[PDB]
Structures are given as C-alpha cells and as structure tokens.
Design a protein around this ligand. Structure first.
Ligand SMILES: Nc1ncnc2c1ncn2[C@@H]1O[C@H](COP(=O)(O)OP(=O)(O)OP(=O)(O)O)[C@@H](O)[C@H]1O
Ligand SMILES: [Mn+2]
Length: 336
C-alpha cells in the first residue's frame, strides 16, 4: 500500500529513515516520511542520510521523490534488491557505518554475497564505530544466522572525513534464536586509545584513569598518521560471560584527557550497575535483526527512543510483535 511515517517520532532523528529504508527494501513495501529531522540544527537530509537514500535506491532500483540535501520529505518505492559490489561516498565526515546500517539488511536476502564500501566519517561520537560493529554487533548477528564482516580501511575524523569502511555480507541460509538474559560475570575488560595528530601523553593519561577504576586485561594505544586526524577516541570493551559490549568517547579540543576518560568510566559503570545484557545502543541495533529472524530477546536497562522507534517501524512493516516487560529496573525486549 503506502506506509506514512512521521519523522518527528521518538527523538526525531535519522534512525526512523534508515530503518524504514531497510525494511522497505526487504519487504517491497513503499513508504512516505515527512518532517525528516525537522527539529534539528541542520534539518532534513544531511550527506549521511542522502547517501543512505542513494545507496538504497541504487541497490533496489527504487522510485524516489525528494532525495536531496536538506529535504524533509521522502517517498520511496523499492524495486528488486540486487547483490553486488557497491561503493558510496558521503563527501563529509558523516557516518560511514550508518550508511552501511541502512543497506546491509537488504543484502542478507540477495541471491549471492555482496560487498559495500562507504567513504566518510569513522569516529563520529553519535554513531556505531566500525570496531563496535565488528566486535559487538556482528558476533551477535552470527548467532542469529546473519553473516557479515565489517572492516575499517582508513580513519576519517571530523570535519575532514576521508575514512573508509567496508562490509562483506553473505545471504542468510537459516535463522537461529538468540536469547540474552543477564550480563553474567566479567571475564575481561580492555581499554583502548586512538590517536591522530594528538600528543602521545594524552593516551597515557586516558588509560591511567581507566586502570585506576578497572582491572584491565589489555591496555592498547593506537597511533595513526596526522592526516587521518586530528582525532582522539577512548574505548572500553567489557567482556562478560554471556556477552561482550563496548563503549567509547571522542575527545574534543577544549575538553581535557583525564575527564574524557572520566565520562567513559561513568557510562561504563552505568552499564555495570544493571544486570542488563545489552547496552543502550546495541539494544536498538538488535531490533531489526531479531525481527527478521522471527524470534529472539534481550534485556536492556533503559529502553531508548531509538529502540522504541525501531520497534514501531518494524511493526508497521512486518507481522512480528514485540513485548516489553520490566523486572526490577531491567526491561526484557522479546518477540512474541
Ligand atoms: N556510542 C555508541 N555506540 C554504538 N552505537 C551508537 C553509539 N551512539 C549511537 N549509536 C547508534 O547510532 C544510531 C544513532 O542514530 P540517531 O538518529 O541517534 O543519529 P544521530 O547521530 O544522533 O543524529 P540525528 O539524531 O540528528 O540524526 C543508533 O543506532 C545508535 O544506537
Ligand atoms: Mn540522535
């Protein structure tokens, strides 16, 4: 028919559009969306979102109205999804991985394998880093029966970009059921700093803060050429018995090293203070995979707007339904 979506849903960001594109491509169901990111400083499609739309259009031969920078309304009628070897350029420090997030789910259903390469930003503070996709999400996707492998080829920091991320994907042969309960005991914590055009002592100070609070099985410092930067990220990977999670912060010019690491330690203790298996962000990224699988569940401490938006969009496009039940400060998200 036609699914009409309100871009103001939830936190009114690009997530509704990315999820709609994936599900539209997969199901063949057309959608219209209005008020796209209408309440933002730079409203409508930014280069990240336009590149997502262009990639979706190209992969499935879509009929489209409104794909242009700044547009707040899109109409998208998908055609047949084709596997293949694709390359896209954002042309800004917009998130490579969010473009990949948009089109990879459609490729889980093509006849043969695909590869998608996107150039743009790689360490955006409000997007999943390539290492998160590779080390946290993808191992879970594998348990669901979805096989994709993401590799960061080059870093590209804000505002220059020029980073490159690629993902190899194979069509799903069979889906499996993944049920995540409590997080389980800690097995290993691993701290990591990335540096580009930033003095090496910044990294040591950042790690020292992390180690003061946590027993670290690893302390890693990665130095890159100065053209990939100026950039700085601090990450903590938490391996528990039942799951691995990963949290990260991005240093800024007028914020110091010791406090950059401090807000990471804060975010991480927030995760550990709950028994929830999955963190805030991973939760919204498991909704579509489990929905397409027809089964699955996980626990999360505080269901976010993006999580709830993703569930709502899924339910408009697919016959699946989600249950959300809270037990003692932890919400179990499950397919009915
Ligand atoms: N620190 C993080 N680690 C892993 N994934 C993240 C992290 N931060 C955000 N994400 C993921 O990136 C996506 C964010 O989409 P969202 O709509 O929030 O875009 P945004 O970058 O905040 O900009 P806008 O909301 O203005 O479009 C969600 O899937 C979210 O889970
Ligand atoms: Mn957002």
């Amino acid at each position: 028919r036609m699914i009409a979506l309100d871009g103001a849903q939830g936190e009114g960001g690009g997530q509704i559009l990315r999820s709609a594109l994936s599900l539209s491509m997969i199901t063949g169901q057309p959608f219209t969306i209005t008020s796209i990111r209408a309440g933002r400083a730079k409203p409508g499609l930014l280069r990240q979102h336009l590149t997502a739309v262009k990639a979706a259009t190209e992969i499935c031969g879509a009929t489209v109205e409104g794909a242009e920078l700044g547009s707040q309304r899109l109409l998208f009628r998908p055609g047949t999804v084709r596997g293949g070897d694709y390359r896209f350029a954002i042309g800004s420090a917009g998130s490579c991985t969010l473009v990949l997030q948009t089109v990879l789910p459609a490729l889980w259903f093509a006849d043969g394998p695909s590869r998608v390469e996107v150039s743009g930003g790689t360490d955006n503070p409000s997007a999943p880093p390539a290492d998160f996709i590779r080390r946290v999400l993808e191992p879970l996707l594998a348990k669901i029966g979805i096989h994709q492998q993401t590799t960061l080829l080059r870093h590209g920091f804000y505002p220059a970009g020029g980073g490159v991320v690629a993902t190899e994907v194979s069509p799903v042969a069979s889906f499996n059921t993944l049920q995540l309960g409590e997080r389980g005991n800690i097995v290993q914590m691993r701290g990591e700093v990335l540096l580009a055009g930033v003095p090496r002592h910044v990294a040591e100070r950042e790690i020292a803060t992390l180690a003061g609070s946590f027993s670290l099985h690893e302390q890693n410092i990665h130095n890159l050429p100065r053209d990939q930067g100026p950039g700085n990220t601090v990450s903590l990977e938490v391996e528990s018995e039942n799951i691995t999670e990963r949290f990260f912060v991005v240093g800024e010019k007028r914020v110091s090293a010791e406090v950059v690491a401090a807000q990471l330690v804060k975010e991480v203790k927030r995760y550990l203070a709950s028994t929830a298996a999955v963190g805030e962000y991973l939760a919204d990224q498991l909704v579509l995979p489990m929905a397409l699988a027809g089964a699955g569940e996980f626990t999360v401490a505080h269901p976010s707007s993006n999580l709830l938006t993703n569930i709502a969009v899924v339910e408009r496009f697919l016959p699946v339904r989600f249950s959300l039940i809270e037990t003692d400060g932890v919400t179990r998200v499950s397919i009915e």
